[PDB]
Structure formats: C-alpha cells, structure tokens
Design a protein around this ligand. Structure first.
Ligand SMILES: [Zn+2]
Lengths: 119, 49, 50, 52, 85, 101, 71, 14
RNA sequence: AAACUUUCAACAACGGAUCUCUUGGUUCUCGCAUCGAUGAAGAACGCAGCGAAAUGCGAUACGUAAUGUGAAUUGCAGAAUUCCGUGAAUCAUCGAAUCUUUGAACGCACAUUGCGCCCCUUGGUAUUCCAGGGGGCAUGCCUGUUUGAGCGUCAUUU
RNA sequence: AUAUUGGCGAGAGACCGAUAGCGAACAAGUACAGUGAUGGAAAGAUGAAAAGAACUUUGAAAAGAGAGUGAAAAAGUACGU
RNA sequence: GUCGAAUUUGGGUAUAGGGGCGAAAGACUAAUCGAACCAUCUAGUAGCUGGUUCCUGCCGAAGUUUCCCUCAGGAUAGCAG
RNA sequence: CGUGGAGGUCAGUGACGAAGCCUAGACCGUAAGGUCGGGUCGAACGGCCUCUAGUGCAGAUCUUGGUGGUAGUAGCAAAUAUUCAAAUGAGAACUUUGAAGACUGAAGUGGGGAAAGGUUCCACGUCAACAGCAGUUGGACGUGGGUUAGUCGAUCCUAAGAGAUGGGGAAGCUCCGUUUCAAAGGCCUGAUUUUAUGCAGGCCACCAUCGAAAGGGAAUCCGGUUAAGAUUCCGGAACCUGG
RNA sequence: CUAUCUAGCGAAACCACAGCCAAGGGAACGGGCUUGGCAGAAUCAGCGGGGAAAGAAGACCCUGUUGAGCUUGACUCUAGU
C-alpha cells in the first residue's frame, strides 16, 4: 500500500522528518527479519514511501527557494530552465526583434502591401 | 585494348565515380513537395499571386 | 596478488557474484529462450585479463 | 549493402600452408579465425556483382 | 629459447585499466590509454577504425540524458506540469 | 641503409653521461665586486674524487659578503693545494698556488 | 559471527563502503544506545563491508542482539 | 602456423 | 557352406539439408532538427521478495512525483484496501525530482577508492588538534568593480 | 530552391529469407583471442494448449518396458519436416 | 664451457619501425625481422596458374602473314559462324 | 528443359491432406526433364501466355558444416614402488583408516613469501561432463562460510627518469623545456578588544607534481584461539605520533 | 622399460579407384592397357624392395616489361651544408 503524496503535501516539514525516521527504523526492523525468513515483500512499500517523502520534502524546499528568488534576475542553476545549451545561448526575441531606426522607418513607410490581381 | 573499327570513346570513369552517383529517385516526391510548397506559400500570401 | 588495489578487488568481487548458474525459475517464464548462462567463467578455463 | 562482406581485415596466407589462397580471417579464439573472406564462393562473403 | 620457455617470464603487465574506458589498455610507463587516448581530452578515434568507432560511439551505452531529448523536443521543452483535467 | 652509431649519439638516449656520483660543476666563483676590486678569502675544506674526472676537486668555502651565509664553491684542485689552505680570489691577490688572479 | 557475539561481546554488521570507524561508532551509539570500545573493519570478497564492533563490559551484545531481533 | 625445419634440405638439391 | 566384402530395400541411427514459416535485415521515398561546464557521449561499481545476463535505474537505485487510462502483475510467493475509486498495472505519458564513482572533468593527484585549503555548524573541558555534517577552492578569455605597481606621466603643493 | 550511408519519426519494395540478408532475426559488437592497437563468432521453429508423461514394475541410479496426455509421441525440451 | 667477475639476476626507467638497440651474427625488437604488428588506401595490379554450373540440333577452325623493348602476350590479314 | 520472383488466366489443387522427402514400382520424352502409384508429412501450391534475374556444379590445394577408411590401430613406457586387511559403497589397482615397505634427504617432493592468478582456501551435499584407465575421491559440480591492524605494508621521500605552468615553436592533433628572458608565494609573534581578523611590524625565496608493497622510513611482542583468520582477534604486557 | 597378449581409453598423417608379376608398346621405367604367367576365405607378428609413398604451388635454373635489400662517377631528385 504505502503512503500517498497528496496527504503529505499538506503536512509541515517536521512532520515529514518524523515520518521519515520512523520509516527508516521500520526498514531496519524488516531487514533484520529478511535474513530469517525467505521472503519479505513488504519492504518494497517502505522503500517506496521513503522515496515519496523525500520527493515531497525536496519539492517543498525548492518551491520556497523559487518564491524567495521570485522577481529578480540571477536565480539558481537548478531552479531556472534547462532547455539546451544552444537555446540558452541564443538571442531572445527581444535581442532578435531589434532593428535600427533606419529600418523601422522603412518598414513603417514601405511594408509589403496586400494586393490582388483580377481588376 | 584497341581493337576493331569502332570510334575512340572518351569515358571519364577512371576516378572513384561510384562514390558519387546520384540517381534521382527523388523526382516524383520532390515534385509533390514543390506543389505543396507552392500551395502553402499561396495560402500564406492568400490574396497575392 | 595479495597486496592488491581496491579497484582490482572490486572487479573480482563482481566476477565472483556473477559466477552463478541460472536461477531455475527463469526457464519457466513465458516466451523464455534462456537455457543456461553462456557468460559463465571459471578460473581455470578463461582468465579475466584485468 | 556496399559494406557487405568487406567488414573484415582478411588477408591471404599464401602458399606453404596446404590451404587455398583465398583471403582468410585473422586472430584467434573464435571459429571465424582462419575462415575464408571477401569472396563470392565464401560464407560471410561478398556476392558477385553486388546489386546497385 | 624464443618460444615456450621465454613465455614463462611473462608476469609484468604492460597495460592496466583506464578510468575513462575500463579496458586494460592503459600503458603504465607512458601514462596513456591505447583505446581512449586518456588523459588527452579528445577520445581517440580514427576513421580507418570504423568498427572501433562503432564499438564506442553513442548508443552503445545508456544515454542517461540524451534518450529524453527527442521527447522534450516533441513536447517543446516545456516546463510546469499538468492540471488535472 | 641504416642510421649509424655516430648518428645515434645525438638523441641522447643511452649515450648521455652518468652524472650521479659527480659532486657538481667545477665552476669558479662568480665575479661579483671583490674579485675585481680586491680579494676575498676562502678555505679548502676537503679534496675529493669526482667520478668521470681524473683530476680531484677542492671544496673551497667562501663567505657571502652580503648575507650571513657560507656559500661553498667547487674548484678543481691544483697540484700542491691542501686542506686547511687559504685560497685568495681576486684582482689584488698574491701570486701563490691555488689563487684565482 | 553468532559465536563472536555470545563470547567476545562483538557485534557483526554489514556497513556502507563509504563509512569509516568514526561513523560506525557514532551510529551504533545512536541507533542502539551503547558505548563502543573498538571497531575492526574488513571489506568482504563480495564487495560489502563488515564491521566487528566490540562494546564495553557494561553492556552485553547478546542482550541487545535479541532486542534488535536476531539470534 | 608451423614452419617445420626438416623439409629444409639444400644437400643434393642444387 | 557360414563369417567377411559389396549392392539394393524396409525399420533404426548419425547428421541437420530441403520445404514451409519470420517481432530481423537491406534499399527507396517522405518529414523534422534536438548533445554538452545547468556537466554530454562513454566507463566502473551497484539496486529487484526469489536475476547470472539483456533491458531499466542510481543509496529516493528494474525506480519517486505529476498526468492519463481505469483493475491488473504472473514463473512462484505475497499483498490486498487498491475495486461505484484522488486508484491496480514490468501500463502509457512525462512538464517535477533523485541522479553513486568517473569522464571535456573543474582543489592537487590517481598503477593510490590517496593528499590538502577556506566558510558555517555539531561533539570531544578547544581560533590552533581530532572527528562528523553541509557548502565551496580549475584554466583561458570578455565586461565591470575593488585593491594596487611603474620618474610612463600631468597638474598642484610650500 | 540544393545536399544528407548520421540522429528522431513515418511509409513502401518485381529485395534477402537463418551458410542468405547488416558482423549481428537469439542475453552481438556478446562470448572468445590478443600485451596492445585491434580482431570477432556460432546460435531461429515441440505442440492449438505443457495437457512437459500421474501411476505400476526391472534397475544402485540414469533409464527401460507398460499405462497415460494429446489430432499426432513416425511431435518427448538430444523436440516441425 | 665458465663459476668473484667485461659475472648472474629481479624490479623501476629510457630508447619505437627506414626507426631503435647492436663486444656486428643483418643479430634482437612479444613463436614476426635484409625493415615488426594493427587497421585503412584495397575487391591494389597480374601478358602467369587454377576454376568457370542444363539438353539437343546445324555449321565448324587455327597454330600462319606484317608490326610492336615483340618472343608465355597483343594489333593486323587469314581460317569459322 | 529446369529454378527464385512479377502481370494475366485456369471462377486451377489443397487439412477428405499443399510443398518436401524415400521408393532395384509404372508411363512419356533422343535428352534436359515431366507425370502417376505407394509410404512419410503437415499448410500451402501449381498448369498455360508473358515479364524479370543474385537462375542450373563433380572439380577451383574452392567456402562453411558434417561424416568416413585408417582403427578398437598408433599408442596411454622419463621422475627407483608398491603390498595386505578393514570400513564406506550398487560397485574399489586408485577414496579413508590402519599395518608394512620406500622415496624427497634441509642447494628438499619441507616451511614461507614476491610477481601473476583470483576464491582455486574451508565445510556440506555430490559424480552427467572434466581429472587422455577408473573414481564412492578432487584445484571438478551445486550450495554456503571465510580475509578484523595506531605499531606489517601502501600512504610520505627522493632515484634514474616522467611531466603541467610561464614562455617559445607548430596549419594543427600537439612539440620543447622543468627554473627557464614570470610582478610566480606563506610563516611567527601579535595589535584590537564596534570584531572579527584588518592594519602594526618583522621573517622568508625555495619556485608544481609524479616516480620504489626489494631503496630511505615514527612505533608490538608473547601465549592462546578457527573447519577456514591472525605480529590484525582474546588475554597480558609495551611503544610511537598528534593534542 | 618398450614392443607383444589382455581390461579400460583412444587419435593422426594419408586416401581418384585401388592394390600379384614378366615383357610389350605407351608422355620413351604401368597396379590397371595388350599378350602371357597365374590366381582359394579371413588373418597375426615383423620388414623396410616398391607404391616414381607422405611432408612444401622447387629454395637451384629460366621467364616475367613482378619485386625488395645492398652498392656506385647509373637516371632523376633531396634533407642538410
Ligand atoms: Zn582507457
């Protein structure tokens, strides 16, 4: 069965810490039994739940750091995007849509007109 | 090498020509693509000719 | 050798754990074609070359 | 495939070994070693006049 | 003398393992792998060695990051997450 | 043909010198101020054998005139030079054996 | 190993290969509430780490090993 | 692989 | 005359041809543009209740979360509340995470699981020693700041 | 507009049909060789379904003879023909 | 044969292919040396050798001319279809 | 004449048995080859008009695979040498024990290690393959256990030598060189008591790093203990370093 | 100690088919052909006459408009100087 994440996301941080150490104690108490018994598949669920709890904690802290660095340039290299080396190095649409005044005037005066040819 | 009465031929296949042989199997698919591109350009410039 | 590096010892340990026959329940699985372990190594027959 | 039959480093052994002079596969430990190579009459071989 | 007896004197390894290729091709006296070129920055490759390139190039391993690049591209390198439709 | 033995002696692979037991380069003292305006005194502390050299060496000790230090020079010994002997190096030095006029 | 823990007051554990004697000592003190006298580590030939942990005379490894739940 | 040495005879050959 | 030899047939063998199959290849065409210091490709070691591999993954280890579908997985065992439901599944999807030791590999090194330095903190009666925990310390180049050096050099000093 | 034995995704063939076709239809760039660079395989098909032969007997056992499953054991994992 | 030294030897280390090393034998350089090994150019060229896959029917030779660094071959005329 | 495939026809044959294979059984054809019957077998296949080609084998010291005669033959003969009984077992020239006879003969067939190997160590079970006969045994097979260090070593130092940096060459992969034509760094005491560490002084100039399980080197010994570990574990008795 | 016989184990070289001679002719020295002599299962141990026995596409010689090593007032160049 295991624990669910939707019911952990409501909990605080300290509750999760206690949940976590309880679960690791339980996993120890299971790995002392696995050597006596041949089979013990319950252990997978506890491993699974530990992983879920850690994922939740990681997300809770990463979101706090996002809101901390909200509204400013220079946020960290694991919170902002990843997309690709090239696309990160490429011109923004600002930096690419930049024109000279010489060409803006010509674009406003003489743009491609919408013509049609029957009569 | 030279033999009976036949014209002196000048066939330029003493290089590695069989690395550069372009057979145009592409012809029909490419015509299709040309037609579709023309139609696309038309739709983009929808009134224009 | 006896006075050996950890890396060598580690690679040996891996070889040891690998020196096993099949688990005989894999043969019973559906669409199974594995009859035996064909990567099986023995110290007399074939050397690791590490 | 143009590569077909030619993905080997085979060399004839010559004369004095009591074998045909077809190119043969070098090395050891395999079964393929010593086997004929590159030829139409040979297994793993190149077909005669490969289709273009 | 040059055969069977002289092969008994062979107990010193000219090559050991490399930390970039794991192949037992690292020469101890020259400090150079004969497969990977380590510790050169450029992985050793030659185009006369086609089978060799074929044995080490991309795909021959896991592609721990690059498997997913086609998928991220297909979905447009998006961020955020779904919305429980 | 083949590269001959005299041609192979320039790479310096096995034809280099065997220089481990040699005590050092038997150089005279650097020409500073004393040796061109006066003299400076040193003392011979030991005569020793140098491997690959049929002439013995003399470990002459001079003083550094600028720092409290005891820079030691390695001279080729001359016939008659002995331990406890004072060597005088410079322009205004006497014409005796061992001196560096 | 069960002969060791009855007689010599020596617990035998499987340990992370990144761990050392300091960590093992601290961790036995934490998880089992016992004072450790010495630690002796070997790397087994299956690649795992084995720790022999000898406790003080105040405690008895036989009495805490069944508290853990193995004997 | 083998180059046996006994087939080598130059006595009476030349 | 039997045995033996040889020939042919039946049945039995040896062997694995032929025949029929084919989640594979090969070629042709179409379409797209997407690796990496935000740490790539590749390598090593490891992870499953019972796996040596392949495949997958990284001490959250044949996987986590999220979304979707909607009751499986399967070789055995086991679990069942998960079955008119925030929910099975070696499911698909994947936008959030983890991502050992390495590698362009980045503290110095490496035939070593070696040797250091800085910050914050904890314990040991401790700025200095020891240990643990977290975070850091490459090169080259660019822009800028700060601190500087040079009778290179100007002015102003009394 | 042109190129494109690579990569991602698709569609097709008067192509090959397991000594062929890619080296690789399979745990294949594997096993194995080699100091090393490098070299480099073999290996497909039971049957619709394991229903993969309970049980009896001879034998130390493997196995045999019987019986039995199955449309067929002239299909018994040394398995289509 | 020699056996206290121009000795024997381990390990580390250097010397890498027209290069090394050589008390010099063209000796050794991983069973490879009058120029190692690996892969590629490379299916290298060959007037030279060997081989060249079904039936029947009709016709049916030449080993000679001239030329060629030509003489184990080709062009040419001739014989044949 | 035959083969692989393609367009067409025969509304062609076929699980009531396609193709294939065997057949000193039949029929046709000069022949290539075709056809029928029987047996086996199990899923597809053919005649005619045309198209197409990776299209027909006795040879190539052909390729790959498989099999023979040779032939139950050569042969399993170096290292002095075995024998008796019992037990085990289905079974004993070879296993185990015992008794005897022998050898290595301390420049050993002993006891330990270096390299290399890598779990071969040890136990239990066990004999299809391996042990060129055998096998109840084994370095085999299967399942498991097992290697404990402040003092032994690596780690540290330099050797021959290797090799970044600065710089210089080179189209370039990279080469030279290792203190060089470099502005190449860090150590004691403190001084303050916003206070943590700046300024106060002063000192110092080497100028990376790698390179030895046989060189150099801080320090441990006895007794006991395991199936298998020990200068490492237990007991006792010591020592070095750092603080 | 082998060989030898036995129990167990168990290869290889080589092989067109095979294995009695004389002469004849014949690719000028035949196991086969012609003419003659002859000719009776299956075989063991030895032997070394023959099988122009096996081992290797002669290493001597010649040919190749194939090479390489070496030399030199060959032909043509060249690092260096
Ligand atoms: Zn490497």
């Amino acid at each position: 069965a295991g624990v669910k994440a939707y019911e952990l996301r409501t909990k605080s941080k300290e509750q999760l810490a206690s949940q976590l150490v309880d679960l690791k104690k339980e996993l120890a108490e299971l790995k002392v039994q696995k050597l006596s018994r041949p089979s013990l598949p319950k252990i997978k669920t506890v491993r699974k739940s530990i992983a879920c709890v850690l994922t939740v904690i990681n997300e809770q802290q990463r979101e706090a750091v996002r809101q901390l660095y909200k509204g400013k340039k220079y946020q960290p290299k694991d919170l902002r995007a990843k997309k690709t080396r090239a696309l990160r190095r490429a011109l923004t649409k600002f930096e690419a849509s930049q024109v000279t005044e010489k060409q803006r005037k010509k674009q406003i005066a003489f743009p491609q007109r919408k013509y049609a040819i029957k009569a | 090498a030279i033999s009976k009465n036949l014209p002196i031929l000048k066939n330029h296949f003493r290089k590695h020509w069989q690395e550069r042989v372009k057979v145009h199997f592409d012809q029909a698919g490419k015509k299709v693509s040309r037609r579709n591109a023309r139609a696309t350009r038309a739709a983009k410039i929808a009134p224009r000719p | 050798a006896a006075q050996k590096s950890f890396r060598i010892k580690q690679k040996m340990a891996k070889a040891k754990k690998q020196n096993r026959p099949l688990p005989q329940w894999i043969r019973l699985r559906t669409n199974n074609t594995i009859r035996y372990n064909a990567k099986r190594r023995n110290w007399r027959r074939t050397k690791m070359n590490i | 495939s143009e590569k077909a039959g030619h993905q080997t480093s085979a060399e004839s052994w010559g004369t004095g070994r009591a074998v045909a002079r077809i190119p043969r596969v070098g090395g050891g430990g395999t079964g393929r070693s010593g086997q004929g190579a590159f030829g139409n009459m040979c297994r793993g071989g190149r077909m005669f006049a490969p289709t273009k | 003398g040059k055969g069977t007896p002289s092969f008994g004197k062979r107990h010193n390894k000219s090559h050991t393992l490399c930390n970039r290729c794991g192949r037992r091709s690292f020469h101890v006296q020259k400090k150079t792998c004969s497969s990977c070129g380590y510790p050169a920055a450029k992985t050793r490759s030659y185009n006369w060695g086609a089978k060799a390139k074929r044995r080490h190039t991309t795909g021959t391993g896991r592609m721990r990051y690059l498997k997913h690049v086609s998928r991220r591209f297909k979905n447009g390198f998006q961020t955020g997450s779904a919305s429980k439709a | 043909g083949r590269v001959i033995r005299n041609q192979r002696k320039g790479a310096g692979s096995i034809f280099t010198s065997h220089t481990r037991l040699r005590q050092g380069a038997a150089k005279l003292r650097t020409l500073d101020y004393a040796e061109r305006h006066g003299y400076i005194r040193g003392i011979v502390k030991q005569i020793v054998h140098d491997s690959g050299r049929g002439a013995p060496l003399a470990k002459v000790v001079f003083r550094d005139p600028y720092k409290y230090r005891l820079r030691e020079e390695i001279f080729i010994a001359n016939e008659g030079v002995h331990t406890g002997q004072f060597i005088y190096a410079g322009k205004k030095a006497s014409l005796n054996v061992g001196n560096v006029l | 190993a069960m002969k060791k823990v009855e007689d010599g007051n020596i617990l035998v554990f499987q340990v992370s290969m990144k761990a050392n004697k300091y960590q093992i000592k601290k961790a036995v003190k934490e998880l089992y509430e016992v004072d450790v006298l010495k630690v002796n580590t070997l790397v087994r030939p299956n690649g795992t780490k084995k720790a022999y942990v000898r406790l003080t005379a105040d405690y008895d490894a036989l009495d805490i090993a069944n508290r853990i739940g193995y004997i | 692989f083998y180059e046996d040495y006994l087939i080598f005879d130059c006595r009476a050959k030349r």
